[PDB]
Design a protein around this ligand. Structure first.
Ligand SMILES: CCCCCCCCCCCCCCCCCC(=O)OC[C@H](COP(=O)([O-])OCC(O)COP(=O)([O-])OC[C@@H](COC(=O)CCCCCCCCCCCCCCCCC)OC(=O)CCCCCCCCCCCCCCCCC)OC(=O)CCCCCCCCCCCCCCCCC
Ligand SMILES: CCCCCCCCCCCCCCCCCC(=O)OC[C@H](COP(=O)(O)OCCN)OC(=O)CCCCCCCCCCCCCCCCC
Ligand SMILES: NC(=O)C1=CN([C@@H]2O[C@H](COP(=O)(O)OP(=O)(O)OC[C@H]3O[C@@H](n4cnc5c(N)ncnc54)[C@H](OP(=O)(O)O)[C@@H]3O)[C@@H](O)[C@H]2O)C=CC1
Ligand code: SF4
Ligand code: SF4
Ligand code: SF4
Ligand SMILES: [Zn+2]
Lengths: 125, 136, 334, 181, 140, 123, 114, 117, 310, 239
């Protein structure tokens, strides 16, 4: 199922496959934009490490880091491919299943439906 | 031109004191008309002697013994590099920067106590709690 | 990932009430939060101590005298870790500037001969007194004062006498200082030890090369110093850092000859003649064997019965026979 | 012969004047060679920071691209009319062999055509069987050339070389370096 | 004497070595100041680190630095040698030669013009000119 | 032509495990034989028995790898390493990477239980 | 050559923390922080250039929509330690103030070509 | 003048160098570190250093606050901060400012203040 | 490569500028290679004479781009900025005397019998082995094969200008030296032609979705400001695909294999450096020679080692 | 007749145009007939080696042949050696890491035919454990390119006489051009004063790598394009 340690032929540090957890997901539809072009690929990136994520240099005020994977992120065409890759490397992962908008029928004419009782609210346009 | 006659003629044109000054600073003997003077005190010359090759027709005589290219005032630095035709003193008022602050020229201070000390211009990102006790 | 091997924990509180929070894993770009002034940092032991300190990014203030001698120390730390301060023992304001911002002050200032400007007293007692006064006035959290083994007040040797007086004045001024007494230190490019035995024209002893001391590796002394720096339980204690086994000078010379595949020349001279020779050569400007060094050639190492040792720092000294080949390799010829 | 020697007074380099000129011409290996020093009043003057053309420069543009009244951007939007990459697998080359091509069809109409396309796209015919059934006309016209020869590796712009000999060459006859045009 | 006989070891690694050659070209003529580039480190005063320092080259650079007789100075030329430069985040590049050898003057640029390198040389000579040698011994 | 260099072996993936173990044991023997040469070349402080111990550990690490292709790759990389060492292509700096244990003690605090790891934020 | 941050004739800074210079810089030399100034303006509170990462490519100067960051013709600023080569906001503004006249020469000469 | 350090010791700084700028005493942005704090945190690197040589450029907030308000007839003031003397585009992008509200309205790019009269 | 992926066209003036400056670049590179070669064998003087010409041309670089060496001037779509006002005259003025500057180096080198002793029949390479080893440029034209990408795959304005291609016959260091020396002359010819035929118009492609708009539009026009913002923050998106595009670089065939995934950042970029293939062929060429012949061979391969390892 | 009277070029009358006319043309149009020719040529090649050629693709002037790893030696020999092809020059060899595929790497060969003035590209695939047959027996130049491909990616080349790292440091672990290898590597070096030698340490950056790829566009930027396939290579529609 999962490649153990020390028969990975990549040469990466053992710590990568021992005490690091990656996460696989699809990017969420950004709330700020209506475009959806970034949401189809399956990203893979590493969960952060507490001590080594980022600190502030005491000279010019920069963001120092000891985590060599903080900037790395792979793109895959499909969830199964990402799973296969992570398994072949021996990475512990978690899958975050995507959420989608539930379909509902929208009619422009619905803005002008006659109301037989009291108006619940004044639509304004 | 490397000729000895050039050196003799320049020395005669310039005078013995200036010849010794040039031999003790630049090592050549240059004769040219003064153009202007910095805020720092250096003096800038241009020459039209035909025996002078391209890129040797403008030069500077530093004011101090411990001369340094960083002591050339900006604007003169550009002129001395053949950046512009017209020297800073000869430039119209329209093409001069307007300043709302006093202008101060400071050369390169490296190797001195005046060297630049860098620092972070921001206070820390996360502000800690000021501890206060309350009585039960 | 790296690790702050010198630190016990992450948050630290100095005796002066400063809160120090180590940032980072513990490598070059990290910072322990401590600041240390190392007097005599450009010397034989100071270089190793400074390298170990700046390896983990504790700010090291290095007071120096000659600009060109201290340049190798800048390589040991990240940008802004190793800071250089011009200093002189006869300029009090300079000492004040050196110690003002530190949580740790260690001084290694000691000279094995006398100069036209600093005699043994001036360098070991008044110098230590001035440094300790700056420490006491600025209430520095930790002060480490390094003396020499066999430091005794009423010694025959002016070196040991002034060293004992320096210890006494340090204890009088700063009651919480830590006193370290290392044995003869060897190592790469040591002073008046292995390297001298390896390239001397002839070693001349006034006492048959009979003297015994427990030589100790300089790296081990520096590591012990670091440990003393970062644990607050060594305050007001005395440490006698010395090597595992006791050697005779002749034994060390025999070991050096065996490892060098070459015979070291030994010549034995009367004590008076060698005194006169050393006193005569003290007239040249470069350091040379002292008269008081040959006086010390009649003193064997004396270990205080009641003194903390390497064991109390959970350290184990390396063996001089083991390092020999590593420490003198460029002279084998072969 | 164009590119031949031009005299030293048509080169923008300082040179010599007076008696020294005659001395130079007497003592020069080739009298028409310049000295390498640019002429100070002529060269790089006026300086780049004081060109008069700076105060007249306007951004350059070309018709019809700069027109304000007849160019819709989508008519000249070449980035998004880019040619797709055409991938042909063995099934597609099969289909081409049997059913012919859009340019010259060899397919029947109605359901027959669609079912032929289907069973080739399913794997009914292999490529080797395709080639075997293939007649002489189709092999010669549509795999080899009409003469039956294989096609030569295509070239976008054929280059016809010519060798320049004699006075127009770079080197004279002896040297082991020839001039191709 | 130290300023008048300024002998570097050439140690040229990349695009900065070209501006280092143009210093010696006729227009600037480093030789007119007394600068002779000498191939052996034994006969050299100054090391000029002119180029990207890789991890594969770091031991060799430190070795050539160690084999220069004293007194010795080092000038770091170019962004790549100063701070790792345009390859600062590469997996095989040392982020600055001052990780390896002590450095006296940093010349900024990519590549520093020949005039900037000459200015850095003048800075090194100014540092030499203010050095106490026997006066320092007198202070001892 | 461009001819192979010293101790170069053409890349060949063994079709059978046994034919691979033959080569593997040959390579191990080569490493053990070369140990003194490595000790001379790289001016190491430590002893030849320690070199040989390190080699044995390296070969031990992959003693239970099953799939043949992975074994082939590991053997090829091991041979590339051997050729790198024996030809003095490597320097002392990269050679001592193999030997992290013989360096001295790095410090007083190498945490082992949860409380010491927690105190240093490494829990 | 070396970098400098410009002002308006009124002496108000020109940099409005749009951070395009930060985004285009091929060496990731530039570090910028910003927030609402007390008078409501959008200004920088930290603007650093690591002069030892910079490749002196001049993209930062082509990018800025208000000509705030520019590259002076100055090449003579060699230093004796590396910490002087980490320019903060104060240093870059000081350079702008010091070199404004030469900057105006270069701008008057080349602005039609940008 | 006297800043107490984390050590508990005193750091003495001349009054002129505690001002954030030559013309302004206090910070002009919440995240901006004050000179007092700068020294308190970096005093090791400021020892034996000459403060009068450090950059200290002028605070532009006050300089723009000294510029008089421009009065405009209509509802919209147009500003582009151009340099009428030199060639090319040397200003900031041309924007239009509404001045119907009471008071002065600042240009978003240059800070020049406009008002409807 | 990027324009081929982008399916855009460089304006005419831009093409001509790129040809002129490609040949100024060829002249600079050959000055460095030939003079460094002669310095390796021992001829120290052409180094300095040719370095003054290098200085003169780096003046032109600095005037059009602002940097002496790393111009960053030629960009996908054209060139970054139009030529300054007084550049064509200065280039022509330099071109009137470069011919003599070449003749002097040739006086010292072409007929000197010591030069021919160091170069004749040294580093001989056969035509077939040249093709087999992947050699290109002079290293291939020296062996008798007339192949030149400027003539074979006419790129830029290499079809609007007239020039010849020198081809050796013995494939030794001396033939390659002759080839380089004649490429000097051909480059001077091309530079003159472009000085005489430089047209008017734009220098970068006139679609502000690829190249940024002029600053006078960017500060007045909304669309231009948006496009400027996006180009310098996100970048233009290249249609997906891949390409291998090679040119006749001064050192031989230089090519890039770029893989585009439809995004703003390349998916893969491999550079084919001619020096890599040459240094690979070193062990075949240099076998059986003397150590000084190895020095001369390295000289004739004309290696830079930024190319070799990237 | 001398340089003091040489005529001033700077005052000569320059040419002046009023309006510049540059017609709008799609640059792909110039390749249409050549694309047809490449199609015909690729058809011939597939018909000639149906046992080997899994497919081809044509884009403007670049033809690609897709083959399985076992087919490389025969197809390369046919290319190098057939009279109508004669692809004598190896140009480059490389790999491209596709982590979505089962076979990660795709190995690319570019060939050049100086005889015919034509180029061709040949692709195969491989994995981190399955090798590709080396073509050094056919093209001498491929030696170094295959050492580079192995070094960067890890792809093995069966039959390569001397396959070892060419670029990375001695004793480097990892194949840098793999999409899972981080930008900055895992280790860095410095000079260690205690050990007097250059030591390797875990990576620790003073400023962390800021990846600005998060700001990629949220709108599809280009679209589908257009197909330049010749009508002689599109399947016919019934009726
Ligand atoms: C003028 C002549 C030259 C001056 C020499 C200066 C000098 O001594 O420097 C040595 C100097 C000392 O080196 P070091 O760095 O101090 O290291 C010394 C060892 O660590 C170990 O150092 P050490 O502690 O073992 O000390 C060795 C000691 C040797 O000491 C002894 O062994 C003497 C023991 C006898 C003591 C009692 C004698 C009788 C007393 C009588 C009372 C009066 O040598 C000295 O230090 C002499 C000190 C007195 C110098 C007098 C100079 C006065 C002129 C001004 O050696 C060098 O610098 C090496 C330079 C490279 C030499 C290469 C060329 C040499 C070969 C040439 C052969 C000649 C052939 C001619 C045909
Ligand atoms: C040309 C000028 C040459 C003369 C140089 C002038 C030197 C001036 C020296 C002032 C004298 C001060 C003095 O007392 O020097 C004594 C000095 C030893 O002094 P010290 O620093 O203590 O070294 C002890 C190490 N064993 O011992 C020495 O200084 C020895 C110096 C002898 C130099 C003789 C040159 C003739
Ligand atoms: N090495 C040994 O065998 C033993 C040494 N020790 C002690 O170890 C400490 C250092 O050992 P080591 O490092 O070998 O000694 P070093 O001589 O190697 O370094 C000693 C330091 O003392 C400084 N120093 C001496 N006199 C003065 C002064 N008057 N003013 C300022 N600085 C001065 C030197 O600075 P500069 O370089 O500027 O002169 C040097 O940095 C000394 O205290 C020594 O007594 C004790 C027992 C054994
Ligand atoms: S600093 Fe720039 S010019 Fe110098 S070597 Fe590095 S990349 Fe090349
Ligand atoms: S010159 Fe280039 S590297 Fe330097 S700040 Fe500007 S864009 Fe960044
Ligand atoms: S691009 Fe210009 S205006 Fe924008 S943040 Fe950078 S310097 Fe300021
Ligand atoms: Zn405005």
């Amino acid at each position: 199922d999962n490649v153990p340690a020390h028969e990975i032929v990549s040469g990466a540090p053992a710590e990568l496959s021992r005490n690091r957890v990656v996460r696989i997901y699809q990017q969420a539809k950004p709330a700020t934009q209506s475009g959806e072009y970034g949401t189809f690929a399956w990203r893979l990136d590493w969960d952060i490490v507490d001590v080594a994520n980022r600190w502030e240099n005491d000279l010019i005020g920069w963001q120092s880091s000891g985590d060599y994977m903080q900037a790395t992120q792979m793109k895959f065409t499909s969830k199964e491919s990402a799973i296969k890759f992570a398994n072949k490397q021996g990475w512990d992962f978690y899958i975050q299943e995507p959420h989608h908008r539930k379909f509902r029928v929208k009619q422009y004419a619905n803005n002008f439906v006659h109301s037989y009782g009291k108006l619940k609210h004044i639509r304004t346009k | 031109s490397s000729s000895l006659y050039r050196v003799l003629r320049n020395a005669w044109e310039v005078g013995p004191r200036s010849y010794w000054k040039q031999l003790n600073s630049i090592g050549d003997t240059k004769s040219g008309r003064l153009v202007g003077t910095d805020i720092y005190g250096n003096k800038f010359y241009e020459t039209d002697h035909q025996d002078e090759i391209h890129l040797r027709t403008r030069y500077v005589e530093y004011k101090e013994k411990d001369y340094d290219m960083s002591q050339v005032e900006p604007g003169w630095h550009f002129w001395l590099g053949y950046g512009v035709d017209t020297a800073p003193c000869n430039t119209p008022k329209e093409k001069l920067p307007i300043r709302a602050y006093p202008y101060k020229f400071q050369p390169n201070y490296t190797g001195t106590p005046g060297a630049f000390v860098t620092y972070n211009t921001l206070k820390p990102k996360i502000s800690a709690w000021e501890p206060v006790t309350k009585q039960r | 990932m790296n690790s702050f091997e010198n630190l016990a924990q992450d948050v630290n509180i100095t005796r002066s009430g400063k809160t120090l929070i180590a940032k980072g894993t513990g490598g070059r770009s990290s910072r322990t939060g401590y600041t240390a002034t190392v007097f005599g940092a450009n010397g034989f032991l100071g270089s190793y101590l400074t390298a170990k300190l700046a390896k983990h990014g504790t700010t090291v203030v290095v007071p120096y005298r000659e600009e060109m001698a201290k340049r190798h120390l800048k390589v040991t730390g990240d940008l802004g870790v190793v800071n250089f301060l011009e200093m002189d023992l006869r300029n009090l304001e300079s000492i004040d500037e050196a110690v003002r911002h530190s949580d740790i002050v260690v001084n290694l200032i000691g000279r094995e001969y006398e100069t036209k400007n600093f005699n043994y007293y001036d360098v070991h007692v008044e110098g230590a007194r001035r440094i300790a006064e700056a420490v006491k006035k600025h209430n520095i959290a930790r002060y480490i004062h390094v003396s020499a083994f066999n430091a005794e007040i009423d010694s025959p040797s002016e070196f040991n006498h002034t060293k004992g007086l320096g210890e006494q004045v340090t204890k009088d001024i700063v009651p919480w200082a830590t006193i370290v007494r290392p044995a003869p230190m060897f190592g790469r490019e040591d002073k008046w030890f292995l390297d001298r035995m390896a390239r001397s024209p002839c070693l001349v002893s006034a006492n048959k090369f009979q003297e015994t001391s427990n030589p100790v590796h300089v790296i081990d002394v520096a590591a012990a110093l670091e440990r003393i720096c970062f644990d607050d339980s060594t305050v007001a204690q005395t440490f006698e850092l010395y090597g595992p086994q006791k050697f005779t000078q002749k034994q060390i010379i025999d070991m050096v000859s065996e490892t060098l595949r070459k015979e070291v020349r030994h010549i034995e001279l009367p004590k008076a003649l060698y005194q006169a020779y050393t006193k005569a050569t003290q007239a040249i400007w470069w350091p040379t064997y002292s008269p008081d060094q040959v006086e010390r050639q009649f003193l064997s190492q004396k270990i205080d019965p009641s003194a903390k040792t390497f064991n109390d720092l959970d350290l184990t000294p390396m063996e001089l026979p083991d390092l020999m080949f590593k420490l003198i390799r460029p002279y084998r010829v072969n | 012969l164009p590119g031949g020697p031009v005299p030293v007074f048509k080169k923008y380099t300082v040179g010599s004047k007076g008696i020294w000129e005659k001395l130079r011409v007497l003592l020069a290996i080739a009298p028409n060679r310049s000295t390498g020093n640019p002429i100070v009043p002529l060269y790089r003057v006026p300086t780049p920071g004081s060109r008069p053309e700076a105060n007249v420069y306007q951004d350059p543009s070309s018709y019809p691209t700069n027109d304000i009244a007849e160019n819709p951007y989508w008519k000249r939007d070449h980035r998004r009319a880019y040619p797709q990459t055409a991938f042909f697998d063995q099934k597609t080359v099969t289909g081409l062999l049997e059913l012919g091509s859009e340019a010259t069809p060899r397919i029947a109409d109605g359901e027959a055509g669609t079912k032929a396309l289907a069973n080739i796209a399913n794997g009914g015919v292999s490529f080797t069987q395709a080639l075997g059934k293939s007649s002489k006309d189709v092999i010669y016209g549509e795999v080899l050339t009409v003469n039956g020869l294989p096609p030569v590796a295509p070239t976008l712009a054929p280059k016809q070389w010519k060798i320049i000999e004699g006075e127009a060459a770079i080197y004279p006859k002896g040297y082991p370096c020839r001039t191709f045009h | 004497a130290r300023q008048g006989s300024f002998w570097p070891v050439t140690f040229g690694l990349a695009c900065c070595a070209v501006e280092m050659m143009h210093v010696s070209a006729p227009r600037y003529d480093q030789d007119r100041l007394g600068i002779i580039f000498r191939a052996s480190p034994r006969q050299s005063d100054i090391m000029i680190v002119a180029g990207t320092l890789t991890n594969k080259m770091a031991p060799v650079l430190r070795q050539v630095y160690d084999q220069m007789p004293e007194p010795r100075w080092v000038i770091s030329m170019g962004s790549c040698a100063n701070g790792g430069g345009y390859y600062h985040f590469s997996y095989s590049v040392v982020r600055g030669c001052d990780r390896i050898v002590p450095v006296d003057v940093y010349v900024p640029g990519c590549p520093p013009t020949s005039e900037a390198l000459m200015y850095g040389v003048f800075q090194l000579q100014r540092k030499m000119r203010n050095t106490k040698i026997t006066r320092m011994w007198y202070r001892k | 032509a461009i001819i192979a260099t010293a101790f170069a072996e053409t890349v060949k993936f063994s079709g059978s495990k046994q034919e691979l173990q033959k080569r593997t044991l040959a390579l191990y023997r080569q490493f053990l034989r070369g140990a003194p040469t490595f000790a001379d070349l790289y001016e190491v402080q430590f002893s030849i028995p320690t070199i040989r111990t390190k080699i044995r550990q390296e070969f031990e690490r992959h003693r239970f790898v099953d799939d043949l292709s992975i074994q082939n790759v590991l053997y090829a990389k091991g041979h590339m390493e051997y050729q790198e060492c024996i030809n003095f292509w490597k320097q002392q700096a990269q050679f001592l990477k193999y030997f992290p244990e013989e360096d001295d003690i790095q410090g007083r605090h190498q945490p082992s239980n949860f409380v010491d790891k927690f105190l240093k934020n490494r829990a | 050559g070396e970098h400098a941050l410009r002002r308006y004739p009124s002496g108000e800074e020109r940099c409005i923390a749009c951070k395009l210079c930060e985004a285009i810089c091929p060496a990731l030399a530039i570090t910028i922080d910003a927030e609402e100034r007390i008078d409501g303006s959008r200004r920088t509170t930290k603007y650093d250039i690591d002069m030892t990462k910079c490749i002196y490519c001049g993209y930062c100067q082509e990018s800025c929509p208000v000509d705030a960051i520019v590259e002076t013709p100055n090449v003579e600023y060699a230093t004796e330690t590396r910490e002087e080569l980490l320019y903060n906001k104060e240093k870059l503004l000081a350079n702008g103030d010091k070199w404004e006249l030469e900057l105006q020469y270069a701008l008057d000469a080349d602005a039609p070509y940008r | 003048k006297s800043i107490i350090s984390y050590n508990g010791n005193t750091i003495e700084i001349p009054e002129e160098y505690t001002k954030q700028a030559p013309n302004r005493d206090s910070t002009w942005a919440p995240a901006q570190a004050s000179k007092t704090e700068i020294y308190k945190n970096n005093m090791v690197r400021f020892e034996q250093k000459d403060l009068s040589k450090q950059p200290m450029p002028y605070a532009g907030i006050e300089l723009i606050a000294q510029q008089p308000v421009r009065f405009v007839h209509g509802n919209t003031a147009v500003c582009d901060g151009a340099n009428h003397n030199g060639p090319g585009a040397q200003g900031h992008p041309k924007i239009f400012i509404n001045v119907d509200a009471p008071g002065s309205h600042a240009c978003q790019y240059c800070g020049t203040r406009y008002e409807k009269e | 490569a990027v324009e081929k992926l982008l399916n855009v066209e460089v304006p005419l003036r831009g093409k001509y500028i790129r040809t002129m400056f490609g040949e100024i670049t060829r002249v600079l590179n050959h000055l460095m290679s030939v003079c460094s070669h002669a310095m390796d064998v021992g001829a120290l003087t052409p180094f300095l004479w040719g370095f003054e010409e290098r200085e003169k041309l780096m003046e032109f670089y600095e005037r059009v781009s602002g940097a002496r060496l790393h111009a960053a001037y030629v960009r996908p779509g054209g060139v970054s900025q139009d030529l300054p006002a007084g550049l064509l005259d200065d280039i022509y003025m330099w071109a009137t005397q470069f011919g003599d500057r070449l003749d002097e180096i040739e006086e010292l080198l072409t007929d000197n019998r010591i030069w021919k002793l160091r170069t004749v029949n040294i580093g001989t390479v056969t035509a077939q082995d040249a093709l087999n080893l992947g050699l290109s440029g002079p290293m291939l034209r020296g062996s008798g094969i007339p192949f030149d990408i400027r003539k074979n795959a006419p790129y830029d304005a290499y079809d609007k200008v007239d020039f010849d291609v020198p081809v050796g016959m013995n494939g030794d260091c001396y033939d390659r030296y002759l080839i380089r020396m004649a490429e000097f002359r051909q480059s001077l010819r091309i530079i003159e032609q472009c000085c005489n035929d430089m047209p008017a118009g734009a220098v970068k492609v006139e679609d502000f979705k690829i190249n940024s708009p002029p600053r006078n539009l960017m500060k007045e026009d909304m669309e231009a400001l948006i496009h400027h913002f996006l180009l310098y923050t996100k970048g233009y998106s290249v249609p997906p695909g891949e390409t291998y595009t090679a040119i006749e670089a001064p050192k031989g065939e230089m090519g890039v294999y770029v893989v585009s995934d439809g995004s703003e950042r390349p998916y893969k970029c491999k550079i084919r450096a001619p020096g890599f293939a040459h240094l690979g062929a070193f062990d075949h060429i240099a076998r059986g020679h003397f150590l000084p012949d190895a020095v001369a061979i390295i000289g004739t391969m004309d290696l830079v080692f930024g190319e070799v390892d990237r | 007749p001398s340089w003091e009277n040489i005529k001033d070029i700077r005052l000569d009358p320059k040419v002046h145009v009023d309006e510049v006319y540059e017609p709008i043309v799609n640059p792909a149009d110039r390749y249409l007939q050549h694309v047809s020719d490449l199609h015909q040529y690729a058809k011939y090649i597939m018909a000639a080696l149906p046992k080997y050629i899994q497919g081809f693709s044509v884009w403007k002037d670049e033809l690609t042949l897709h083959v399985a790893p076992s087919a490389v030696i025969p197809v390369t020999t046919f290319l190098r050696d057939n009279t109508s092809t004669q692809y004598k020059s190896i140009i480059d060899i490389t790999a491209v890491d596709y982590p979505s595929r089962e076979n990660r790497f795709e190995v690319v060969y570019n060939f050049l035919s100086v005889r015919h003035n034509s180029r061709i590209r040949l692709k195969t695939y491989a994995t981190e454990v399955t090798p590709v047959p080396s073509i050094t027996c056919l093209y001498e130049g491929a030696n170094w390119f295959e050492r580079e491909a192995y070094d960067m990616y890890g792809v093995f080349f069966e039959g390569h006489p001397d396959l070892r790292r060419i670029m990375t440091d001695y004793g480097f672990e990892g194949h840098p051009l793999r999409k899972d290898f981080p930008l900055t590597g895992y280790t860095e070096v410095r000079w260690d004063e205690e050990k007097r030698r250059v030591v390797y340490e875990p990576l620790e950056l003073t400023q962390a790598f800021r990846n600005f790829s998060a700001g990629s566009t949220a709108w599809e930027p280009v679209g589908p394009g257009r197909d330049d396939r010749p009508d002689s290579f599109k399947l016919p529609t019934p009726k």
